[PDB]
Design an enzyme around this catalytic site. Structure first.
Site: not given
Ligand code: HEM
Ligand code: HEM
Lengths: 735, 734
Positions: A92, A265
């Site tokens: 982010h 993810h």
């Molecule tokens: C279309 C693009 C993306 C969308 C819409 C998206 C959406 C989200 C959402 C809604 C969450 C959950 C937040 C929560 O409720 O805690 C999340 C978590 C996460 N995203 Fe994405 N994401 C995207 C791209 C990415 C990218 C590019 C990365 C890194 C390279 C990333 C890595 C993560 C990680 C590691 C989590 C887990 C956080 C945790 O374990 O607390 N995401 N994402």
């Protein structure tokens, strides 16, 4: 509107109705008054590069990796590991970047200030920053917040089994909110926050390629797209079109986009355990007891099994703390059915799937596979489907793409490689770094510079006006937000800049042929010395400024810093450089604005990217006019009978009350100055000219330079500002 | 819609901003104004040196000649710009409010938004433009701030009214001062006053209920409405507004009548055409206007067609020459209510002589006229007695006007040490907060080393008390009007010595101890004498130095000798009442109001001390480490090493093992509980906790909380300490 107004009206500390309330359309200089050295707690003389190079970098990384599994009771770690949360924090921080204007990204550490600290998509990243604070406390000045947030995600991936290409530090911290960024004009956040950027269209498939420039998110308060689908409609095909648009606006292609989403993810989970009405104000709206945190959750202790972030409750893989190919495996091998999370949001669950996805706190509990709409996007577009299918069977190709795309994400706004610090900077040079060859040869000395200045000034086709204009045209492509552009590389000689209409390509051609003659003559004759075309462009403009000051009766040293190199076309990508092309240029009286960006607003915006103060912007414009330095050689704004002599005639004649100024066109862009007594038309001016005699704070500077006796001060101040601007990209030397 | 542009720019700061989303959050903007980078003269420019080299008599000669050199683009009434220039100066100086010390002419703010575009400043854009050639000629050696006032002064003298003299010394400023609370209304006069009267429209009853600290009856006015309260042509009610507004500007009845009767000897008002003919004010005008505004489309917009206020009054039969005609007319004529050509209410002597001159036609004459605000002065019992006396004894009006006009123009210039030029009046006036000549010879570094050792071993004195007392004395300073500070030792006099915020019984015992140190020194050191003022500062300064040594940092803390002690006769209890703080975050004193939180009051005070955000932050943390609260309590004293100059306030504030919760209903008290032991560890105030809450202030707290930064903390504290102690040192200078 109640919007933008506090219900209690303060009478202290700036409270009360303000000038911008009365006259909201008037030009504001606020963006030229940010980031001043008084505001910086560390002082102006602190050298961040020296500090970071003295950092015990290996021990910082080992301390980070140890923190990942030291669960804090006020925010317990999912699966006993903060790694996913830390990857999200880094993504982010970097993820706000827009390629067209070069704003956002991680390079100023702005996630720790308003508004980013309080955007809905950054919910509970206040906890993440708080968890890493003890590393910043231990290491002090030797690592910035900006660097630390991104290093933490890099170390997290490496300690969850994913080896990255390396890392570069070098991002000095900033100390106030950057209020120069156009994030949009909406007055609401997601789930709203997008009527203006779609121009009131709501047809989510048709509009996806029509997002307002230069924006890179589909709602105010999001990083890229809405994880429930466009406008919360759970359609994966339309979601894919939003993803292509948004990631394209961030400078990522289809391969990079699938690699970033499937790579990220692998790790962690989303949080949606309880309804949103249980969640308190965001950090900027929270009470003093929250001590900089926000989104207080009133169910239980508000953490652990009750965590609420996005409203979704998705766990992508069976091993959320370890790199795997389970994301693509789940996505492609399951059949998906639309369900609601505990908080009421749309998500997807596997039909007849294995009940083996682990719970973050209860060893006894398992779940079925789940995905977001925005994950199903990647198999509901033909090009993403083909990439996902290939990587299902060839995970090694995903790992290679993800390493490269993650490195690009974190470093896209860092600048040239001469800015990158630390012991693990990747050796490969990438096109998005705007590569330059290494400088070689014995550097030209003072006497060689004096000989080259005389040769330049005595060359047919070179005059003071053309030399000055060309140098500035090359220099003002610099922008401080992503540290791209400037004079190093001699890119004005390459596509696209050689054909920019704002550079007068036929005149530029003849200027560059003459400079190349100077170069052939010098190279042909001075043993181990060669001069670059980039140093000759800058040295010619510098020589012209020195000559123009002498011709105005002032003997001044105009200092020249040698050592620029010349880029090749293969190091100069047309798409990336097209983003630097100006639509208006007030230094050289080119072009004009539009309804939502007036000529003089474009000039102020550009000055902010050059780090100019109001006095430096003012002095530069007035000296360029005196030099006759317009892009086309016109007389517009050239309010002097001694074109090419460095005097403050522009200001003197602009403020002379015997001249009356009136609009000549319909569109407010052209102005005539008429002698009141004779009725003769004396001058033609543009909005970039006349703003200096209209805006009360700019006019106060104009008056300084118009005062009897200030010719010498004008010259000294112009030369200082010229030197600053010519040297902005000289990171090989120091800023 | 209010405060929004119909076109939403996408450049140069365009777009929704943080303040839009979270408009109640504390803002640090007022600590980021007037930065040296922004000043086109440079931070090293010395205005006093420039002005003392000015050829002053030649400047006044050229102003005098300008008065009768009419310019075709704004022709002079009666051939003389004098009246216009008197109005320009009076409006420049006339925004001053005595209670908070803001407004006045000392920063030259009439040339910036918002004052350049207030309705009461209509056509002063022309006045400023007419004097620009004198600024262009003399350059940096006269400021716009000084020129606008000097011009009015010279105009009086060249129309037959000798003034007391003049002082220069107002350095220019280079941006709009957006720290001033002018009011919360969202309209200008003829509206602009719902909030300041809490929606009352009972014009007599509400007059003495004007919102504090405001000094005008509508947003966009200087003092009062010339057509009566809310435009009601009732002279007796107008008089109640005039007394309220002028009192809020620090003027009494005699001063008030002198100023109005003095000023309206000259010139005339302008109301020749209706307001629909008038274009946008300067900040709203198109680029062709080149910083002017209120373009009038009838004829050439000027000369006989001038339109400023909408009124068309000529007070005397000789508008270019001092006279007693204002009072003579006011008292002797029978007045009738009439309409000006632009539609405004004024008064005429319909059966009087037809001998008041026309400003452009020597063959044309008018009857006597007055404003409703002029008839106020014969429709109040105290104003009438003054007016009647001065009708018969005009020399008493001339005396009162010269003194009040001097006060008007110089009320915010600060100490007499700041006043420049060859005609500074020799009388010492109470509103200058006067100071004497020093006593005996100046202490040297040997005397300072002996006095530091004495002070730190005297009965009733210690590190915490000394540091608290010096800061208490210092924070009375405010840069808006250059009042307060440590020079004069006015903490030792009424009213400061009995302020609840100064803990009068502790203060008395501290002052008695410093006086004993003083008595030991004076008379046993030949002709060397030390002031109480120097001993208050030196004692705090020596305490900071020793507290740094005890925290493990050896630093020479500078000290600048030479303050004097004011007398009580030179320290007026009403004049000094205006400096009493509502809250003082440096010493953890006080509470907020229904309109301003404690942390907002602290940022306001920091702006008056010229502090940056890092300076504010370091000072608060150090004052807590020193145990320097006003009452000696432990609120905010987050250290086990009280009296030692460590960054413990910041370390302990940011420790996540401490949870902070509200204890009082009022929002003003907080408790920090150790989450592992469940024990109450600390008590804090809003001035303490804001440093852990606001994201830009917390960023600075973190610097000081980081390992390795103990010495940086001490260095930054000492720099900020020296800056605050020396703010009023214009004698050196400052
Ligand atoms: C279309 C693009 C993306 C969308 C819409 C998206 C959406 C989200 C959402 C809604 C969450 C959950 C937040 C929560 O409720 O805690 C999340 C978590 C996460 N995203 Fe994405 N994401 C995207 C791209 C990415 C990218 C590019 C990365 C890194 C390279 C990333 C890595 C993560 C990680 C590691 C989590 C887990 C956080 C945790 O374990 O607390 N995401 N994402
Ligand atoms: C109750 C307080 C006062 C009110 C309501 C008031 C009102 C006004 C108004 C409405 C005008 C006409 C502006 C225009 O149409 O051109 C004006 C003009 C003028 N005022 Fe006042 N006034 C006040 C006090 C003062 C004071 C204290 C001074 C100076 C010592 C002053 C000096 C002048 C002068 C010289 C003019 C004439 C300007 C010219 O000739 O262009 N007035 N006054």
């Amino acid at each position: 509107t109640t919007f933008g107004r506090c219900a209690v009206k303060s009478n202290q500390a700036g409270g009360g109705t303000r000038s911008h309330d009365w006259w909201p359309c008037q030009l504001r200089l606020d963006v030229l008054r940010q980031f001043q050295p008084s505001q910086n707690p560390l002082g102006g003389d602190f050298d961040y590069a020296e500090a970071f190079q003295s950092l015990d970098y290996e021990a910082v990384k080992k301390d980070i990796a140890a923190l990942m599994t030291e669960s804090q009771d006020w925010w317990p770690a999912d699966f006993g590991n903060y790694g996913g949360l830390f990857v999200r924090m880094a993504w982010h921080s970097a993820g706000t970047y827009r390629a067209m204007d070069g704003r956002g990204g991680g390079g100023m550490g702005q996630q720790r200030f308003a508004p980013l600290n309080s955007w809905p998509d950054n919910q509970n990243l206040d906890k993440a920053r708080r968890l890493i604070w003890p590393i910043k406390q231990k290491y002090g000045n030797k690592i910035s917040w900006a660097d630390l947030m991104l290093l933490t995600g890099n170390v997290a991936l490496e300690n969850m089994g994913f080896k990255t290409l390396g890392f570069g530090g070098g991002r000095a911290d900033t100390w106030q909110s950057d209020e120069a960024v156009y994030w949009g004009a909406e007055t609401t956040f997601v789930p709203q926050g997008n009527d203006v950027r779609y121009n009131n269209s709501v047809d989510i498939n048709a509009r996806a390629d029509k997002l307002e420039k230069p924006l890179a998110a589909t709602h105010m308060g999001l990083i890229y797209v809405n994880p429930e689908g466009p406008n919360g409609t759970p359609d994966p095909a339309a979601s894919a079109k939003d993803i292509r648009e948004a990631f394209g606006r961030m400078g990522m292609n289809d391969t990079e986009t699938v690699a970033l989403i499937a790579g990220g993810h692998a790790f962690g989970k989303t949080h949606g355990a309880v309804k949103g009405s249980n969640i308190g104000p965001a950090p900027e709206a929270a009470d003093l007891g929250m001590q900089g945190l926000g989104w207080h959750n009133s169910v239980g202790d508000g953490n652990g099994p009750n965590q609420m972030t996005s409203g979704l409750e998705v766990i992508w893989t069976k091993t959320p703390t370890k790199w795997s190919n389970g994301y693509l495996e789940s996505l492609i091998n399951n059949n998906w059915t639309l369900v609601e999370s505990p908080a009421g949001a749309h998500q997807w669950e596997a039909v007849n799937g294995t009940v083996d996805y682990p719970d973050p706190f209860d060893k006894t509990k398992f779940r079925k596979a789940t995905m977001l709409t925005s994950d199903l996007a990647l198999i509901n577009d033909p090009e993403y489907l083909k990439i996902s299918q290939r990587w299902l069977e060839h995970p090694e190709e995903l790992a290679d793409a993800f390493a490269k795309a993650w490195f690009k994400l974190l470093h896209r706004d860092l600048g040239p490689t001469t800015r990158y610090l630390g012991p693990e900077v990747p050796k490969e040079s990438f096109i998005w770094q705007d590569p330059l060859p290494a400088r070689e040869g014995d550097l030209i000395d003072d006497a060689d510079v004096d000989k080259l200045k005389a040769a330049i000034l005595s060359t047919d086709g070179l005059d003071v006006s053309k030399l000055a204009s060309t140098a500035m045209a090359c220099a003002t492509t610099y922008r401080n937000s992503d540290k791209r552009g400037g004079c190093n590389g001699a890119r004005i000689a390459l596509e696209p800049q050689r054909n920019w209409v704002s550079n007068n390509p036929t005149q530029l051609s003849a200027v560059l042929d003459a400079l190349k003659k100077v170069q052939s003559d010098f190279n042909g004759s001075n043993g181990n010395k060669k001069v670059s075309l980039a140093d000759l462009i800058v040295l010619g403009g510098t020589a012209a400024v020195e000559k123009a000051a002498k011709d105005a009766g002032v003997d001044i040293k105009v200092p020249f810093s040698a050592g620029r190199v010349d880029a090749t076309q293969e190091q100069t990508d047309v798409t990336q450089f097209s983003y630097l092309e100006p639509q208006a240029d007030g230094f050289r009286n080119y072009g004009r604005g539009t309804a939502r960006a007036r000529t003089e607003e474009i000039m102020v915006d550009k000055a902010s990217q050059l780090t100019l103060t109001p006095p430096e912007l003012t002095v530069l414009v007035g000296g360029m006019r005196a030099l006759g330095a317009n892009y086309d050689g016109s007389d517009v704004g050239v309010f002097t009978a001694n074109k090419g002599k460095l005097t403050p005639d522009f200001f003197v004649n602009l403020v002379d009350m015997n001249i009356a100024w009136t609009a000549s066109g319909a569109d407010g862009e052209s102005w005539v100055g008429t002698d009141r007594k004779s009725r003769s038309e004396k001058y033609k001016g543009s909005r970039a000219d006349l703003v200096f005699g209209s805006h009360a704070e700019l006019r106060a500077i104009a008056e300084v330079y118009a005062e009897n006796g200030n010719q010498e001060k004008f010259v000294k101040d112009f030369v200082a500002a010229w030197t600053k601007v010519m040297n902005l990209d000289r990171f090989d030397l120091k800023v």
